[PDB]
Design a protein around this ligand. Structure first.
Ligand SMILES: Cc1cc2nc3c(=O)[nH]c(=O)nc-3n(C[C@H](O)[C@H](O)[C@H](O)COP(=O)(O)OP(=O)(O)OC[C@H]3O[C@@H](n4cnc5c(N)ncnc54)[C@H](O)[C@@H]3O)c2cc1C
Length: 398
């Protein structure tokens, strides 16, 4: 009865456990799942929870509800050390042994060495950061309404990054800001929403036609874009950016970083050859020198056969990776060889508020209500893929 230890109950880790628990027998192996929180959260819905267009309770569900308790021991604890050679993992609630390890500790903000970006900006990482950010935004509107001063910079928001997460967050701000304006007696014209991207292109994963749709959509709703504009620092006043190489202070009562993520900080402390919290795995998702250690999700850098660069960090690859791991753990336990992971690009949607978006579905570009409907089908299918039709009905987007 080998000990299968899974670190993190996210997309990658919880998918591995729900698939693996159906396939193993109780005497075949012991599964242990460790997670910081009692819940699993839909990290892909944190744009809505951060802006406050969705109640935080609606992005999460208890982990234990989807577990076969005779096969899985759920441990609510924070992982603090991973000893790959002693086959031990230390947490704040004790030390756990393992025969097979699955590292699925997810992501955290990556600020590219930009001074003050962690200290002076709000991140998009989990439910707690999302709750602090939504509360901060409304508190800025409520303080503006209370003051005799009326400093319109309290109503100014900076968003770092014009990629997928940033653009989705801006889409939620365009739904929320009008409501907060009307609730707190503010004229929308006094609000300033600015997106700063160092890169020369916005949403590089989509076509030019699809980017123009998202740009027009957000510009018509007051978003100003500063593309090919490096953010060289973040202070209490806002972002310090370079325009034609000259430094410029941009002022905002709220600064949000959405331009980069990295894998868990436990990765550099635990395994070799890690870059930005990501380890390049073998084709079966194991790591070099360890046929008993799998690393998936945002902690992994899976390079497909025949390619040079790893696939991007997504909930879609994470869930596909968890299924693969569950099937290879079964093979290992029965003395069978592992099979290579093969990512299937199902496509995706970048949301633009509740009733718009840009995406690729079935290899065809989509936008508008069609995209917004497809984003709800994809979000709900991810709830189904982990917890079944019951959980999809209760916690899904329909
Ligand atoms: C707003 C937003 C929108 C996105 N939209 C999309 C989208 O539409 N489609 C898409 O495919 N991807 C999208 N992504 C990316 C996607 O959310 C991530 O790639 C995905 O979360 C990775 O899954 P994961 O299991 O590796 O990590 P996570 O979802 O980050 O889960 C990691 C888990 O481990 C736990 N944990 C972490 N550290 C510890 C520790 N030390 N001890 C114990 N527990 C710990 C966490 O609490 C969490 O439960 C989006 C991301 C954001 C932020």
């Amino acid at each position: 009865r080998k000990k299968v230890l899974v670190l993190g109950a996210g997309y990658a880790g919880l998918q591995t456990v729900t698939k693996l628990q159906k396939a193993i027998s109780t005497e075949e192996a012991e599964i242990t799942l460790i997670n910081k929180n009692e819940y699993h959260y839909e990290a892909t819905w944190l744009h809505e929870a951060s802006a406050g267009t969705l109640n935080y309770e609606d992005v999460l569900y208890p982990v234990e509800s989807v577990l076969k308790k005779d096969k899985v021991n759920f441990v609510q604890a924070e992982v603090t050390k991973i000893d790959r050679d002693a086959k031990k993992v230390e947490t704040n609630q004790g030390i756990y042994d393992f025969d097979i390890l699955v590292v699925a500790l997810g992501f955290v903000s990556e600020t590219f060495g930009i001074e003050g970006m962690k200290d002076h900006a709000f991140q998009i990482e989990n439910v707690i950061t999302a709750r602090e950010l939504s509360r901060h935004i409304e508190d800025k509107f409520a303080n503006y309404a209370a003051s005799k001063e009326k400093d319109d910079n309290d109503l100014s928001i900076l968003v770092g990054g014009a990629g997928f997460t940033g653009v989705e967050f801006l889409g939620e701000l365009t739904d929320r800001i009008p409501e907060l304006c009307s609730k707190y007696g503010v004229d929308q014209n006094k609000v300033k929403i600015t997106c700063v991207e160092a890169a020369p292109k916005m949403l590089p994963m989509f076509s030019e036609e699809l980017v123009n749709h998202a740009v027009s959509y957000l510009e018509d709703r007051g978003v100003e874009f500063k593309i090919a504009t490096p953010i060289v620092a973040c202070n209490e006043k806002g972002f310090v950016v370079e325009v034609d190489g000259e430094k410029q202070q941009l002022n905002a009562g709220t600064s949000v970083w959405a331009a980069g993520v990295r894998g868990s900080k436990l990765m550099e402390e635990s395994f070799e050859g890690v870059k930005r919290g990501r380890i390049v795995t073998k084709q079966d998702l194991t790591i070099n020198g360890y046929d008993n250690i799998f690393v998936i999700g945002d902690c992994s850098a899976f390079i497909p056969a025949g390619e040079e660069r790893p696939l991007p960090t997504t909930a879609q690859i994470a869930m596909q990776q968890g299924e693969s791991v569950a099937k290879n753990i079964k093979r290992i336990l029965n003395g069978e060889s592992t099979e290579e992971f093969e990512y299937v690009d199902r496509g995706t949607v970048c949301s633009l508020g509740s009733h718009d978006g840009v995406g690729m579905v079935f290899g065809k570009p989509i936008a508008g209500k069609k995209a917004a409907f497809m984003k709800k089908v994809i979000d709900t299918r991810a709830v189904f893929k982990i917890g079944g039709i019951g959980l999809a009905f209760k916690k899904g987007k329909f």
